[PDB]
């Protein structure tokens, strides 16, 4: 076992290195339950640009150092990073204009109707494929 894992990035402080957390369960014969446990694995990152909080896939590889024997193969999800410049633009748009009770409610209703209509078309296409 231990050929492949999917986990979360918890440390990117090393050069071309990363630490990934893994979850697994163990069977306890006496109490007839599965016990949840955790482990930490160090993996090699050629890109050297990982972010703490990413979901990545690591694979078994030749030993590279004392505690590094895995290589990062792919990223399944990218962690969110705060950007002040983008946030300031959004705040300006929100403060640019304001609507009344009725206008805001009518706008909300129209937006939902348009989203619902597109979803119905997609569902019909899926049924046609079936």
């Amino acid at each position: 076992g231990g050929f492949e894992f999917v986990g979360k990035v918890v440390s990117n402080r090393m050069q071309k290195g990363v630490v990934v957390a893994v979850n697994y369960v163990v069977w306890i014969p006496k109490y007839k339950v599965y016990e949840r446990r955790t482990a930490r694995h160090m993996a090699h990152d050629e890109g050297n640009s990982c972010v703490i909080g990413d979901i990545v896939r690591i694979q078994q590889h030749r030993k590279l150092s004392k505690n590094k024997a895995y290589v990062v193969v792919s990223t399944l999800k990218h962690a969110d990073v705060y950007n002040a410049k983008q946030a300031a633009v959004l705040n300006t748009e929100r403060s640019q204009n304001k609507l009344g009770r009725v206008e805001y409610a009518e706008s909300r209703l129209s937006e939902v109707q348009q989203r619902l209509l597109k979803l119905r078309e997609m569902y019909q296409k899926e049924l046609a494929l079936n």
Binding site: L109, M122, E126, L127, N130
Partner: protein, 55 residues
């Protein structure tokens, strides 16, 4: 070797069938939830008109 090759083809066919089932189910749930949201939106519009009169 011949048996192994057939198994790989069988696995690919089974995976494709499973994905289609899940995709349809997800769309069905999403459509139902959106309909509920639309009904609440129509109710809110009526309250907004009523509240404006009080102001």
């Amino acid at each position: 070797e011949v048996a192994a090759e057939q198994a790989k083809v069988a696995f690919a066919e089974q995976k494709a069938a499973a994905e289609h089932v899940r995709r349809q189910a997800a769309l069905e749930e999403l459509l139902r939830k959106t309909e509920i949201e639309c009904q609440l939106a129509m109710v809110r519009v009526g309250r907004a008109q009523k509240a404006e009169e009080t102001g």
